[PDB]
């Protein structure tokens, strides 16, 4: 062994570069979107998700850090059992591979006043045969702070990155689920009291028949995964009618640009 005869010099290879290159190719998956229909029968309403905003949601996402959008919609005049998702709202947020961090404050905009809240959609690195206990906790605590979320009406759509594609599956909480989730302070993967009888799958269908839209923050962007210190559960935000920027867009990571010029 050599102390100086074979000296070599470490060279940094930062983590986000690889994930940025990976996020650039996400558009390839928007043409292989599969909805899990595994539930033999349906419990709840039937939720219809327009492809256009689903594709944008996938495209603005990251393969590891979860992102989330709030779902707003209405029932078609015909039958109240169908819930058409009309809008996805992106709010200031950060996340890990397991969970998302959203502000306490729900979306508030006049443009949304004639629609009802339907829950939320979020990405996941891997398919799971079960709804996450983090997700149950998150949905339950939102319901506990916001009586406009009816447990028989608000859902969680998971968008999991299967290789080459995306798999969507939709859940709703059960009353036992809400009661456990709202008192759960264990953020791990196997918390005490977690039960598969805390959620149940709902029927979901992708559509091209109509188009949804996005709302985004009025002065910030939505992605705070690079500004984590600046994000706070109690932060307030307004909204505007515009489309969201992609995960690695320059306005989401300004320190990468200002720091490089300091070399």
């Amino acid at each position: 062994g050599p102390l100086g005869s074979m000296t070599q010099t470490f060279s940094s290879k930062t983590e986000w570069r690889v994930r940025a290159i990976s996020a650039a190719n996400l558009h390839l998956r928007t043409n292989h979107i599969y909805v899990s229909s595994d539930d033999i029968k349906e419990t709840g309403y039937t939720y219809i998700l327009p492809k256009n905003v689903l594709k944008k949601f996938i495209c603005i996402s990251d393969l590891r850090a979860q992102i989330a959008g709030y779902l707003y919609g209405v029932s078609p005049p015909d039958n109240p059992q169908v819930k058409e998702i009309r809008c996805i709202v992106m709010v200031p947020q950060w996340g890990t591979h397991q969970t998302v961090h959203l502000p306490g404050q729900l979306p508030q905009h006049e443009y949304l006043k004639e629609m009802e809240p339907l829950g939320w959609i979020h990405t996941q690195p891997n398919e799971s045969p079960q709804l996450s206990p983090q997700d149950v906790t998150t949905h339950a605590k939102i319901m506990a702070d916001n009586p406009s979320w009816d447990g028989e009406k608000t859902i969680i759509i998971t968008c999991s990155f299967t290789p080459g594609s995306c798999t969507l599956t939709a859940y709703k909480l059960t009353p036992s689920g809400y009661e456990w989730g709202r008192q759960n302070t264990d953020k791990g993967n196997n918390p005490k009291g977690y039960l598969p009888s805390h959620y149940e799958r709902v029927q979901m269908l992708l559509s091209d028949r109509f188009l949804g839209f996005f709302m985004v923050p009025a002065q910030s962007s939505w992605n705070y995964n690079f500004m984590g210190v600046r994000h706070d559960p109690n932060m307030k935000y307004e909204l505007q009618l515009a489309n969201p920027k992609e995960f690695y867009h320059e306005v989401h990571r300004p320190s990468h640009f200002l720091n490089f010029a300091l070399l």
């Binding site: 060279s11 940094s12 290879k13 930062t14 570069r17 690889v18 940025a20 290159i21 650039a24 558009h27 256009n52 594709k55 944008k56 009309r86 443009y111 109509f210 188009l211 949804g212 839209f213 002065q219 910030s220 600046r230 505007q240 009618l241 515009a242 489309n243 992609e246 690695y248 320059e250 306005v251 990571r253 300004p254 990468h256 640009f257 200002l258 720091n259 490089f260 010029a261 070399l263």
Partner: protein, 1725 residues
């Protein structure tokens, strides 16, 4: 042609570029010798003796020059030697020239002499220079040279008024200076890129002289740019017949005679060669060739040679050393100065007893350049580009003042400053070329320039040039500096790129063209003269003596390269070349063809910044960039941290290039010399490469990528990322404070709401809150708003209002600020629409209105978006969401009226032999539409609507109604309205034939003259009129019973209510319905129209019962119409038209090979061009002259009568054309040849689509946009024009079908399909055009209050459409109360405007009444704004010039045609105008109107289309003058009123006040009136009262012209005038003064006024005026028309008692000389 061979261009390239040496031997001048030394050879060449003075060649005194050129030689006594030899050729001839001479021998002053010759062609008689008539291009290789030339030429030419200027970098925005620049100085590349673009209304056509300086650059890798320029110039001379003089200035090198051939220089006249003995100061040359190969030893040998050579001059001569790096200047000066220190030799440069040491000490102390600090005290200095301007000036002054003794510099000083030195040393000839990626030899031009600096012209007896190089280069440099390095063509390497440029321009359309074009290249000349040099056997040349085959092979190979790379579609059989958008972008952005292949292959809409940077880095411009091992670690550092990740390894040049770009944007300092030169080379071109990418993806509609790419352009330009505070873009702001701001990370937008206090607080630096506040509101910023206007359920019109929301400041915003308007879809993925928006400084405070169409669908999408983003500022953008949640779509249009299959109706159905004689010879049966509507039209009195495609024969349906009317009333009156005057004329001819000749009724055409037209209305049974003539007539319907007793009212082309002139049509129709409801005997209305989606609305508005509205849709045209729409995905107009040229011909041979074809083109010039192009394509085809169907001899008589040569040629080959600038006889000849079948094709301009009397089997519409010069932008054809054009493809009596091909920009295709395959929706625009109509109705008491105005509106089409399409009229509901509120607001705004304009009075905010001004505006039919402006301008002291000015600024002239060709014309027309005004102002229609009026009064000249322009101006001049007369009279001003009254006479007879009345008589001129005044005759009665025999000798006489003279003299007014004052011996003050005035004419009312130079036929008007000249007081006035005898009564109120004498005035409005003047004076008693 066919046996072509594919060459390998790269194997024909001279790789050494300008270092290629074609000569094998080099002959040294006598006395040269070689000495050997350790490691190097020296070659000395002695200085030449100047040549003897020939044969008394004497130096020319400036006095002997032409005097207009002497000012350009102010401050000189005598030309130098070379100028004296060149004076005759340069100044006395226009010969192309080539001057070869040693550098600095005088070539520039010869170029000045050529420029002076050109300037002389534009010297006026007043001594001034026309400056707008011409342009001169001076092409120089280096930019620093360009700047010095701007300086020196500008100073030499200032005294002439000449502006000299460098061509600026942002051509897309700044061309305003180019219009004021007579001498443009620039590089070859800039001139190439400018002539490469079309440019629309360019200035390149004014270029009369091109100077090509340092033309031996031909031998450089840049040489092909010069070959491109010259080839293009000479071929363009051929295809314009407008000469351009070419002047070449060259070093003395072999092949100058071939260069002369290439410039088309006659060797016997324009070729001058001066050998190196003409160097201003002789040159002793020393060449040092180092044999040592080992690098370190070679560099030390170099420094030793330099030191020893310096020592031969230390203290004796200044020495200027040239090195080839900025850092190397300092390194070399330090090497030498330290060698001098060690050897105790520093003292030889600065001795004692000279204050120079002190000057150097003090100027080095305060210099602040550290290398300059270390060096200046020792007498050493450096000079390079990265230095302060005043520090470079310090070096230059100190060297000129002889303080510096050793100066180390780069090439820049040799090219940019005039700083010679006794001794010059070139230290090494190796330089790093990033483009080559390697070290290479210095270019020859650089070497020549540097050595040209040796020897100061008037201080040195000789110069000493020492050149140090490697031994193997000695012969090369020995050749270059001793007249022996031949100039060769470097062109084959650039052949494909150059070829593409000519293809994109349309100069080359096939291989034969390209062979022709290559024949003008310098390459061709050299290939002919030295074939083996260019790869051609001497046997091959003797078998191909013009090198036709060799050129075809070269063109073939280049064409295949371009076709492979998708720049061009190349058809090998034909050899045809089709342009592409990719090809055009490669040419216009100066991109090599491989690069656009790469861009096309890799650009996708889904690209990220990552892949964008990689795509850019793959550009072929960087193909030689490599990654050197010594660069790796440094690059590695940056690559581990770049903000845009790089996918590929640092092994790859692509990654180094990417990292260099990102580093340049982040403004990072790098250390490796290779890396820094490479970064410069990469980023210098990044700008235009990224703009090319931007144009590609923008025109593809890729919203995301368009955003990223425009952003990257701006980051490259501003050298910062988006993440940085946009305040950084104000360079004046301190970087420290903007960094302080950046640190707080808050949004920039929030700065707009705080104030200077709060901003100073948030920055934590309050000291300058105010300052930052200021800059915040200087940052460009726009507010956006929309009015959504549904057209259908799938097409939406958008009106965008752009309100600027920032303070303008010229020092930050210049004179304009450019933006892109981008309409993006639901997902911000597709650009639905986009256009460039320019905010000029003069409109910086004004709202701007933009209107466009976008598709929409059902169910409606949530929203679209309108982004407006700056074209140059980062973070400067506004996005407005356009939500559709409350968009009210119109109802889906109803089904058409079914076409019932009826037995064709025979003519005999009219049951009237007289009536049947109108059609029985023409056809046996009526078409299905006529058959279907006949019963209703002919056998009932119902109002009728007939909607059907143009060409369905709706005119015959109108005739059915007229015949029924003739049966009901022997003196029935039908009024027929059609919207265009040309249609009115055609209908008048046909209907005169039918109803006057064959039925013996009275058919009349309204002229526009009220008295004439009232007569025509009384006497006529069929009255044909355009809308406005009927509007002025029918406003007075209450007092005009012939307007009420109208039996039948027919309105044709009623769909035009929706067009630009629709409001007047809608009003007259509404008025006819209102009158019919008032008079209790109804007036039948028949409306004819193109197919209408909302036909039922029109019918109900006009009172048509459903059973009598026939709403036929386009599928029912009697001649079936086959319509094809071809989209062209090319967004540059001239390129798109080019790509349409051959498709026009193919469409002919496909859809109408034998039958008549009309081609509509957008402009006058294009008619000629496209006629020629059709002919050219014909001759290349097997079928030539296939479009001529009569003998040449049967056509020759027709031909000779024309004045256009091209027109006679094209006609001879079977193709006519039609534009506005042809004589009306020429138009008639072409149209008759077309209807005869003699000529098969006619190319007409769009403007003629309404006045053509020909039809065709096939109509081709070649593009659908035209250039508006007033607004400097392209405008879409109105759909109405397009429907009319399509309607020309219709021949019921000859064809089974009509065919039309519409060629349009691709973005327009869907729109045409929507509004041509289906019926058209029309809307009212009356709500934008009400003031004049409301005003008129208040004059006639139809509207007496606001409630009346609402009820008025209830009769209109506007009111009907407000309920059917509320959003179109900015209503948000259809409730009755919503409509009432809307009408009330419209009424309120319109009445308020009129009241503020003083046209009406409003009492109790309820009742309205007309004011004098409103009554005048209504009576004369004048825009109320015109009358208000008159009221402001007229001033009781107005002179006839002020009158012409005021009336030329009337609103009625702002739509007079504008074409900037006339601009120059116009700028000369203002030169001689007798009357004076303040400012000549470009091309506003008002100044063209004033100018054409000037040219009318003094019959200046005979223009062409401006003649019709003058006629249109004269159509309104008289009413404007009469309005002025009424204004002045109503204000009591006598002299201005009489002035305007004479101005009416002036305009009528085309004279001035101080002209001879005899000018009115026919066949007279100036000498006649001068000799009549010479014999005592200055009045028309003077010439009348004399015997005929004498009169005939008095004037130059023709007998049969005397008969027209006599018709005039008998028509001239001869009125004898009586007048009494009515019982005024008993007059009282303040009471009645009544004057009776009788006029008796002998017998002169045979017809109209004789005024042949006036377009309208007029009747004589008169004014009787009572006035007092003392106080200039108009007392009484009456207007009258006289018919042999008539009396008039004038009223006045007695003002005071006694001493009152009043002048009576009798004033004509038509003739001069017959005004009368009397006096009367009764007293108050």
């Amino acid at each position: 042609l066919a046996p072509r061979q594919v060459l390998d261009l790269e194997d024909l390239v001279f790789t050494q570029g300008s270092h290629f040496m074609a000569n094998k031997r080099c002959q040294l001048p006598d006395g040269s010798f070689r000495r050997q030394r350790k490691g190097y050879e020296e070659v000395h060449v002695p200085a030449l003796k100047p040549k003897p003075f020939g044969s008394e060649e004497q130096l020319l005194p400036v006095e002997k020059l032409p005097k207009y050129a002497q000012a350009g030689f102010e401050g000189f006594k005598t030309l130098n030697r070379i100028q004296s030899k060149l004076y005759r050729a340069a100044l006395e001839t226009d010969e192309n020239l080539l001057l070869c001479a040693p550098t600095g021998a005088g070539k520039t002053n010869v170029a000045l002499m050529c420029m002076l010759r050109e300037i002389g062609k534009h010297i006026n008689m007043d001594g001034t220079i026309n400056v707008d008539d011409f342009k001169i291009i001076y092409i120089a290789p280096m930019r620093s040279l360009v700047q010095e030339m701007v300086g020196s030429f500008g100073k030499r030419l200032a005294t002439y008024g000449i502006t000299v200027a460098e061509l600026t970098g942002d051509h897309q925005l700044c061309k305003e200076e180019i219009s004021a620049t007579q001498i443009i100085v620039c590089t070859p590349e800039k001139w190439d890129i400018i002539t490469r673009k079309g440019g629309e209304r360019t200035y390149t056509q004014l270029v009369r002289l091109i100077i090509l300086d340092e033309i031996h650059l031909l031998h450089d890798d840049r040489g092909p740019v010069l070959e491109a320029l010259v080839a293009r110039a000479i071929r363009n001379i051929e295809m314009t017949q407008e000469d351009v003089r070419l002047i070449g200035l060259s070093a003395t090198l072999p092949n100058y005679e071939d260069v002369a051939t290439f410039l088309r220089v006659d060797p016997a006249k324009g070729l001058f060669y001066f050998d190196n003995s003409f160097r201003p100061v002789p040159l002793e040359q020393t060449y040092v060739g180092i044999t040592e190969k080992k690098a370190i030893k070679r560099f030390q040998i170099m420094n030793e040679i330099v030191y020893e050579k310096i020592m031969e001059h230390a203290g004796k001569n200044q020495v200027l050393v040239f090195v080839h790096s900025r850092k190397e200047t300092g390194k070399t000066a330090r090497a030498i100065r330290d060698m001098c220190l060690e050897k105790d030799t520093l003292g030889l440069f600065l001795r004692e007893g000279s204050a120079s040491t002190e000057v150097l000490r003090t100027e080095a102390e305060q210099c602040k350049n550290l290398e300059l600090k270390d060096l200046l005290p020792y007498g050493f200095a450096i000079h390079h580009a990265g230095m302060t301007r005043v520090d470079r000036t310090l070096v230059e002054d100190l060297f000129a003042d002889k303080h510096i003794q050793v100066l180390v510099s780069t090439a820049t000083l040799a090219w940019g400053v005039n700083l010679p030195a006794h001794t010059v040393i070139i230290k090494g000839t190796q330089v790093y070329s990033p483009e080559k990626g390697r070290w290479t030899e210095l270019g020859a031009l650089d070497i020549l320039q540097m050595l040209g600096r040796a020897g100061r012209p008037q201080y040195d007896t000789k110069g000493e040039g020492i050149l140090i190089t490697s031994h193997g280069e000695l012969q090369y440099y020995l050749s270059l500096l001793n007249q022996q390095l031949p100039i060769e063509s470097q062109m084959v390497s650039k052949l494909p790129d150059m070829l593409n440029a000519e293809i994109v321009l349309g100069n080359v359309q096939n291989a034969k063209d390209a062979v022709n074009w290559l024949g003008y290249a310098y390459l061709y000349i050299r290939m002919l003269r030295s074939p083996t040099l260019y790869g051609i056997s001497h046997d091959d040349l003797k078998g191909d003596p013009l090198l036709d085959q060799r050129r075809l092979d070269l063109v073939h190979t280049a064409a295949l390269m371009l076709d492979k790379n998708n720049l061009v579609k190349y058809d090998k059989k034909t050899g045809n070349f089709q342009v592409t958008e990719l090809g055009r972008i490669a040419s216009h952005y100066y991109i090599t063809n491989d690069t656009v292949q790469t861009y096309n292959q890799l650009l996708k809409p889904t690209l990220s910044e990552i892949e964008l940077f990689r795509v850019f880095s793959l550009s072929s411009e960087f193909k030689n960039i490599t990654v050197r091992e010594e660069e790796k670690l440094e690059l590695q550092k940056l690559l581990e941290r770049v903000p845009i990740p790089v996918k590929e390894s640092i092994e790859e040049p692509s990654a180094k290039i990417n990292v260099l770009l990102q580093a340049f944007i982040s403004q990072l300092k790098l250390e490796g010399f290779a890396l820094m030169a490479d970064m410069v080379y990469v980023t210098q071109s990044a700008g235009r490469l990224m703009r090319a990418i931007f144009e590609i993806v923008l025109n593809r509609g890729w919203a995301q990528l368009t955003d990223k790419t425009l952003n990257l352009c701006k980051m490259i330009d501003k050298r910062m990322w988006q993440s940085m505070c946009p305040l950084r873009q104000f360079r004046k702001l301190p970087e420290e404070v903007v960094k302080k701001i950046e640190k707080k990370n808050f949004p920039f937008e929030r700065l707009y709401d705080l104030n200077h206090n709060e901003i100073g607080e948030l920055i934590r630096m309050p000291k300058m809150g105010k300052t930052i506040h200021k800059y915040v509101h200087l940052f460009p910023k726009l507010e956006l708003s929309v009015h959504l206007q549904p057209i259908t359920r799938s097409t939406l019109k958008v009106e965008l209002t752009i309100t600027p929301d920032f303070q303008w400041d010229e020092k930050v915003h210049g004179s304009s600020e450019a933006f892109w308007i981008l309409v993006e879809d639901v997902d911000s993925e597709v650009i639905l629409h986009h256009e460039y928006f320019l905010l000029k400084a003069k409109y910086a405070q004004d709202e701007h209105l933009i209107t466009f169409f976008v598709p929409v669908f059902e169910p409606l999408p949530p929203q679209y978006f309108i982004r407006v983003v700056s074209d140059r500022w980062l973070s400067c953008e506004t996005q407005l969401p356009v939500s559709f949640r409350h968009l009210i779509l119109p109802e889906k249009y109803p089904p058409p009226t079914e076409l019932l299959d009826l037995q064709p109706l025979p003519v005999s159905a009219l049951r009237n032999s007289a009536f049947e004689s109108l059609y029985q010879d023409k056809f046996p049966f009526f078409n299905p539409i006529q058959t279907q509507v006949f019963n209703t039209v002919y056998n009932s009195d119902d109002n009728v609507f007939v909607g059907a495609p143009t060409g369905s024969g709706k005119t015959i349906c109108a005739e059915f109604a007229i015949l029924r009317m003739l049966l009901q009333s022997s003196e029935g009156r039908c009024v027929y309205i059609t919207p265009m005057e040309a249609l009115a004329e055609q209908v008048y001819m046909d209907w005169y034939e039918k109803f006057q000749d064959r039925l013996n009724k009275k058919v009349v055409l309204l002229t526009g003259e009220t008295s004439t037209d009232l007569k025509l209305l009384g006497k006529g049974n069929i009255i044909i009129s355009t809308p406005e003539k009927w509007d002025i007539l029918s406003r007075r319907w209450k007092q005009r019973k012939n307007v009420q007793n109208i039996n039948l009212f027919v309105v044709d082309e009623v769909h035009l209510i929706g067009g630009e002139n629709g409001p007047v049509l809608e009003v007259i129709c509404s008025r006819m319905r209102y009158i019919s409801s008032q008079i209790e005997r109804p007036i039948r209305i028949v409306a004819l129209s193109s197919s209408l989606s909302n036909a039922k609305d029109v019918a109900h508005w006009l009172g048509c019962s459903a059973t009598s509205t026939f709403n036929f849709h386009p599928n029912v045209r009697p001649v079936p119409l086959e319509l094809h729409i071809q989209g062209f995905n090319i967004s540059h107009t001239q390129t798109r038209l080019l790509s349409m040229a051959k498709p026009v011909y193919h469409a002919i041979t496909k859809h109408s090979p034998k039958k008549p074809v009309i081609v509509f083109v957008p402009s006058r010039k294009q008619t000629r061009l496209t006629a020629i192009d059709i002919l050219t394509t014909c001759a290349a085809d097997i079928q030539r002259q296939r479009f001529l169907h009569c003998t040449e001899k049967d056509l020759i008589p027709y031909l000779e009568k024309l004045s256009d040569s091209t027109l006679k040629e094209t006609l001879l080959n079977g193709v006519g054309y039609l534009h506005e600038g042809l004589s009306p006889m020429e138009r008639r000849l072409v149209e008759q040849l077309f209807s005869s079948g003699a000529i098969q094709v006619v190319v007409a301009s769009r403007s003629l689509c309404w006045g053509m009397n020909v039809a065709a089997h096939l109509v081709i519409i070649m593009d659908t946009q035209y250039y508006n010069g007033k607004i400097h932008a392209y405008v879409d054809y109105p759909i109405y024009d397009v429907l009319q054009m399509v309607g020309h493809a219709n021949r019921p009596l000859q064809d089974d079908e009509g065919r039309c091909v519409i060629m349009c920009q691709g973005s327009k295709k869907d729109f045409f399909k929507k509004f041509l395959y289906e019926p058209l929706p029309v809307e009212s625009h009356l709500d934008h055009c009400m003031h004049d109509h409301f005003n008129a109705e208040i004059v006639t008491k139809t509207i007496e209050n606001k409630q009346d105005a609402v009820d008025y509106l209830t009769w209109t089409f506007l009111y009907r459409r407000m309920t059917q399409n509320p959003n179109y009229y900015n209503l948000q509901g259809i409730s009755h109360r919503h409509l009432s509120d809307h009408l009330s607001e419209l009424v309120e705004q319109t009445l308020s405007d009129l009241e503020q304009s003083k046209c009406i009075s409003i009492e109790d905010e309820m009742d309205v009444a007309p004011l004098n001004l409103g009554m005048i505006a209504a009576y004369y039919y004048i825009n109320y704004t015109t009358i208000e402006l008159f009221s402001m301008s007229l001033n009781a002291k107005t002179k006839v010039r002020g009158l012409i000015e005021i009336i030329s600024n009337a609103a009625e002239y702002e739509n007079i045609p504008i074409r900037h060709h006339e601009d120059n014309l116009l700028r000369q027309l203002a030169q001689k105008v007798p009357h004076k005004l303040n400012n000549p102002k470009f091309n506003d229609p008002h100044v063209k109107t004033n100018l054409l009026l000037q040219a009318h009064l003094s019959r200046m000249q005979l223009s062409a289309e401006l003649q019709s322009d003058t006629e249109e101006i004269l159509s309104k001049a008289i009413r404007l003058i009469q309005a002025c007369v009424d204004v002045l009279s109503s204000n009591g001003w006598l002299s201005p009123a009489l002035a305007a009254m004479e101005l009416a006479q002036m305009v009528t007879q085309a004279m001035w006040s101080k002209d001879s009345y005899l000018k009115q008589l026919p066949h007279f001129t100036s000498e006649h009136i001068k000799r009549c005044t010479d014999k005592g005759v200055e009045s028309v009665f003077d010439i009348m009262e004399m015997e005929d025999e004498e009169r005939n000798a008095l004037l130059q006489l023709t007998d049969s012209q005397i008969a027209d003279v006599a018709r005039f003299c008998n028509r001239y007014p001869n009125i004898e005038l009586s007048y009494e004052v009515v019982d005024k011996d008993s007059i009282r003050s303040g009471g009645p003064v009544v004057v009776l005035v009788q006029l008796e004419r002998e017998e002169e009312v045979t017809g109209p006024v004789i005024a042949p130079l006036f377009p309208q036929k007029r009747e004589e008007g008169w004014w009787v005026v009572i006035g007092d000249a003392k106080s200039n007081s108009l007392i009484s006035i009456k207007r009258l028309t006289l018919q042999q005898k008539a009396k008039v009564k004038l009223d006045f109120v007695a003002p005071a008692t006694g001493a009152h004498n009043y002048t009576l005035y009798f004033m004509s409005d038509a003739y001069m000389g017959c005004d009368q003047e009397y006096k009367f004076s009764v007293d108050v008693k």
